[PDB]
């Protein structure tokens, strides 16, 4: 009977109450409900005991099943008999915001389970809550620890959380569950694009740059991802740095929303592999103009199946031939020539220093069939 004298705060009321240090929090609550009428303003499950801190993130709810002495309580400490139920704004998959009363003492996981049940979602484990704006000044990331509470993470009641389904994708090429292999595919594809080995359009370069932003900086932040934030040399093929790509790139970045790094790498790779130019060995050549002294720069591509003539600026395939249409080919130290015989009127000849390299490649590919 070495009683604990605790100040009980309910609204404007302060009553000092005696408890044995072994008293259970649930019993302490009952004792308060029998003495202070203010304590009866709602059901016992809507209230709890709370130990405040100047830092709201450091305030703690007592667990019903614990004893008061677990919380290292001492004579003269104040305990607040406070309402647990708070509002939580959640952005739905359809973009609408639903406000729901949640128990501030519960974990993010427990709130997500409550959320799913109210909107009729069959598996809460396929979803997560994300932050709208992560406070950079604090250690508050866009990612939320689903084992910790909203209070301890500094999620203020006027803050919205987004409902997002967990991303999963796989095929013969890529698997979202193997981030190692996915990173190998990503880096290769990215590097080919940035160094011009894989020629793409300006519009595509800006899409690839938007994903690259998403991967390297996370979701677009308008307050941080401003004019001159990007070193465009690192995000675009050199030939597109001249152009005002930043506006285009920031819109592509913005269009990604709160897409995970994994999803952005998967989308990058799948987008790179979708282009006709993917896996094509390109040579920058020059075309002679009959009766003129100008030459027209062009991109010549080679694959096991075909030869393509691609516009150097737009990267449009303006012609293509099957490797099986080649009748003869011939190289010199200043030019390369293709003969398609019946499958075209005139040879296709271009000015190039790498004619032997081109011819070597074609020889190799022709070697397999017949």
Curated annotation (Swiss-Prot):
It comes from the Eukaryota. Residues 250-370 are annotated as: Interaction with LAYN. It is found in: Cell projection, Ruffle membrane; Cytoplasm, Cytoskeleton; Cell surface; Cell junction, Focal adhesion. Residues 86-370 form the FERM domain. High molecular weight cytoskeletal protein concentrated at regions of cell-matrix and cell-cell contacts. Involved in connections of major cytoskeletal structures to the plasma membrane. With KANK1 co-organize the assembly of cortical microtubule stabilizing complexes (CMSCs) positioned to control microtubule-actin crosstalk at focal adhesions (FAs) rims. Consists of an N-terminal FERM domain linked via a short unstructured region to a large flexible C-terminal rod which contains 13 amphipathic helical bundles (R1-R13). The rod begins with a five-helix bundle (R1) followed by three four-helix bundles (R2-R4). These are followed by a series of eight five-helix bundles (R5-R7 and R9-R13) in which the N- and C-termini are positioned at opposite ends of the bundle, creating a linear chain. The four-helix bundle R8 does not disrupt the chain because it is inserted into a loop in the R7 five-helix bundle. Part of a complex composed of THSD1, PTK2/FAK1, TLN1 and VCL. Interacts with THSD1; this promotes interaction with PTK2/FAK1 and VCL. Interacts with NRAP and LAYN. Interacts with SYNM. Interacts with ITGB1; the interaction is prevented by competitive binding of ITGB1BP1. Binds with high affinity to VCL and with low affinity to integrins. Interacts with APBB1IP; this inhibits VCL binding. Interacts with PTK2/FAK1. Interacts with PIP5K1C. Interacts with F-actin. Interacts with SVEP1. This is Talin-1. The lineage of its organism: Eukaryota, Metazoa, Chordata, Craniata, Vertebrata.
